[PDB]
Design a protein around this ligand. Structure first.
Ligand SMILES: [Zn+2]
Ligand SMILES: [Zn+2]
Ligand SMILES: [Zn+2]
Lengths: 222, 307, 191
């Protein structure tokens, strides 16, 4: 399954320092937890390295539940828990994870670079010919992680008075994909992302940032 | 073989592919007719069954005439400890003309087979001897080339013997033989031996898998010795109008500093033609090649001079 | 995991023991008394007798003689620790180990390639002596493609730039900028 579900209540009860740090710097804490969980899983099943070589630690039962209308710049780069209704959901898309590049000047293969979720990974020079010239993605040598984009809007029941339902975009990565369908009522825990490529720098208007949520744990309500 | 290291022989030049071709649709080397197996067997036969009939005790000192000459030479080698066996190309010619011709025309291939044969014999016998390296066979006394400027290009890369006077000898040139690379990240070390005159650098660490982190440490490598001998040829066939000839020789790892200026020698070595770069800083080479001799054997003995 | 040169580290430990235990006829620590003088500036070499080394530990002396080049930096670090744990020499100061009284002497004609990298002693007549220039022993370069600092790259008797930028996604192998104020130098003369 590649995913280990940690209860935030249990984590807080046992080690409160980790619980307090998790909602403040979730990216580093999640990476550390993934590494530690991979170490423990390999210790238990040393043969399991050939299946996944990576363990995703899904947090659960976060105390504070924020509704989409209450997400502000304060909650940027933090682990948040919200509830909503999946309105649209793209197919499963192969996103680059460890990308190898072909240098189409000498055919060398620039080795794997971790494709982060913020910026495109643009190699520098080819180590052999030192040519910064054009590169291509070697799709045979590359390894991809499943990618899905969903939209979740405030549930009509929760929407009150004459206010419109606010919607947000969420990103599912290689284990949360196909965990929801359009119309499903879900609870989503993830990082309130801000900085990938969206700042409206095209002078089209004011310098606002299109925010997305990197889903860390999805719990359907049924 | 007794596990003793097989020393590389720069005097034979950079190795080749050693490609083998079957002459039927027997198993010669590409471009030659040496048949390493047959050559090695024939050389073992020569080494174990050669008796010089018209030899003289004065000519051969410390050698039992009736007993096989080169077997006695191997005994001397075992006694002393110098793994060099000097073999007479005239003896080879007398024993088997075809073997002599093959040695002359294909030295870089035939000689290592002779090394293998000699080591096999010498370790089948004297099985407990200790030597810093395997035996190296040095042929000499090839059919004398009267004038070195009668050599045509069809005589390139083959064994010849010339007589000359040593005019100059250069300092020692350290020739690399085994590059020692070390990673600058994890300090993992590897060694790459000369393939064909080129050292294929690691380009990626075998320990941390970092690319182009392996730096070549120069003073932790294995080096050879080379010397340049400027020798004024002393031909005995001098045609009308021809002037004195100066030739370049290269000595490798044991013949270095074995001849001083003023010494008259008979040098046996490989006639090598090499390209010349138009500039020191470019890889273009003139279509005309300059020749030089890679020395295999010095001979300081002459019948018409003192000692 | 920064592969260890076990032979060299063993040599370093043995040489430090030799420094801190070896004694003269009087019975005191002669090399402690000598290293007492290394604290002063413009004084960064300790002279050690190969005879004393051989007496104290024949195996250590033979190892040093037969692998002098590879082990020499470790001997220098051993001397640095020996001086530091006694006195308050500047942290950045380097120390060198000179050897003398080597029993055997070779000839410049006998200085073949087989003698490369291993301790030797020769006799010569000085023809001319060049001036005293600072020499680069280890420089810290800056990458001109990503401003990554590649630190402590050794110089092998030649101006050597980093073979590759540390940044995995940057294959800069040409455009480096030496940082003189961060590099270390040693006195140098060619005679
Ligand atoms: Zn390239
Ligand atoms: Zn490495
Ligand atoms: Zn760089």
């Amino acid at each position: 399954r590649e995913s280990l579900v940690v209860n935030y209540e249990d984590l807080a009860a046992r080690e409160h320092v980790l619980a307090y740090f998790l909602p403040e710097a979730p990216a580093e804490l999640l990476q550390i937890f993934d590494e530690a969980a991979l170490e423990v899983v390999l210790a238990m099943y040393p043969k399991y390295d050939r299946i996944t070589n990576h363990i995703h630690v899904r947090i659960s039962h976060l105390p504070l539940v924020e509704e989409l209308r209450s997400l502000r710049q304060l909650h940027l780069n933090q682990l948040i828990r919200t509830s909503g209704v999946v309105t649209s959901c793209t197919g499963v898309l192969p996103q680059l994870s460890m990308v190898k590049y072909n240098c189409n000047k000498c055919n060398f293969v620039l080795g794997p670079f971790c494709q982060s979720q913020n910026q495109e990974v643009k190699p520098g020079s080819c180590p052999e010919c030192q040519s910064a010239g054009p590169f291509e993605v070697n799709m045979e040598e590359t390894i991809y992680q499943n990618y899905q984009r969903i939209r979740i809007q405030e549930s009509p029941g929760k929407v009150a008075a004459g206010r419109l339902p606010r919607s947000k975009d969420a990103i599912l990565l290689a284990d949360l994909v196909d965990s929801c369908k359009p119309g499903d009522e879900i609870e989503l825990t993830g990082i309130y992302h801000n900085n990938y490529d969206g700042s409206l720098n095209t002078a089209n208007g004011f310098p606002v940032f299109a925010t997305v949520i990197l889903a860390n744990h999805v719990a359907k309500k049924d | 073989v007794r596990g003793t290291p097989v020393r590389q022989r720069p005097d034979l030049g950079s190795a080749q592919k050693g490609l083998q071709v079957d002459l039927q649709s027997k198993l010669v080397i590409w471009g030659t007719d040496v048949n390493v197996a047959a050559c090695k067997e024939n050389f073992q036969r020569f080494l174990q069954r050669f008796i010089d009939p018209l030899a003289k005790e004065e000519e051969n000192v410390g050698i039992d005439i009736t007993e096989p000459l080169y077997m006695q030479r191997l005994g001397e080698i075992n006694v002393i400890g110098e793994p060099f066996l000097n073999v007479n190309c005239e003896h080879i010619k007398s024993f088997d003309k075809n073997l002599y011709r093959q040695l002359i025309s294909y030295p870089q291939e035939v000689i290592p087979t002779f090394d293998m044969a000699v080591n096999e014999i010498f370790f089948d016998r004297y099985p407990d001897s200790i030597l810093e390296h395997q035996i190296q066979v040095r042929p000499f006394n090839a059919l004398k080339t009267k004038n070195m400027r009668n050599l045509n290009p069809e005589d390139i890369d083959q064994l010849i013997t010339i007589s000359g006077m040593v005019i100059r000898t250069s300092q020692l040139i350290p020739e690399m033989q085994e590059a020692f690379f070390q990673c600058q990240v994890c300090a993992h070390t590897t060694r790459v031996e000369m393939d064909r005159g080129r050292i294929a650098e690691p380009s990626v660490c075998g320990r941390c898998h970092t690319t182009h982190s392996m730096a070549l440490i120069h003073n932790r490598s294995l080096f050879s010795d080379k010397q340049m001998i400027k020798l004024q040829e002393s031909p005995e066939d001098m045609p009308a109008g021809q002037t004195p000839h100066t030739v370049i020789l290269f000595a490798h790892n044991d013949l270095v500093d074995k001849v001083q200026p003023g010494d008259r020698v008979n040098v046996t070595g490989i006639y090598r033609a090499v390209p010349i770069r138009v500039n020191p800083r470019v890889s273009n080479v003139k279509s005309v090649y300059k020749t030089h001799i890679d020395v295999i054997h010095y001979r300081k003995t002459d019948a018409k001079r003192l000692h | 995991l920064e592969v260890r040169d076990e032979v060299a580290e063993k040599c370093q430990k043995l040489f430090l023991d030799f420094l801190e235990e070896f004694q003269s006829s009087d019975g005191e620590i002669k090399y402690l008394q000598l290293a007492e003088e290394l604290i002063r500036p413009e004084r960064n070499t300790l002279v050690v007798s190969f005879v004393d080394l051989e007496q104290f530990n024949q195996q250590l002396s033979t190892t040093i003689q037969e692998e002098f080049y590879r082990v020499y930096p470790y001997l220098c670090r051993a001397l640095k620790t020996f001086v530091k744990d006694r006195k308050e020499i500047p942290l950045a100061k380097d120390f060198y180990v000179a050897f003398q009284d080597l029993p055997t002497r070779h000839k410049i004609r006998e200085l073949t390639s087989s003698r490369i990298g291993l301790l030797t002693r020769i006799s010569g007549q000085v023809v001319r002596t060049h001036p005293v220039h600072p020499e680069l022993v280890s420089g810290t370069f800056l990458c001109l493609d990503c401003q990554t600092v590649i630190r402590d790259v050794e110089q092998q008797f030649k101006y050597t730039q980093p073979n590759i930028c540390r940044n995995p996604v940057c294959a800069n192998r040409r455009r480096f900028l030496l940082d003189t104020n961060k590099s270390r130098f040693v006195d140098f003369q060619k005679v």
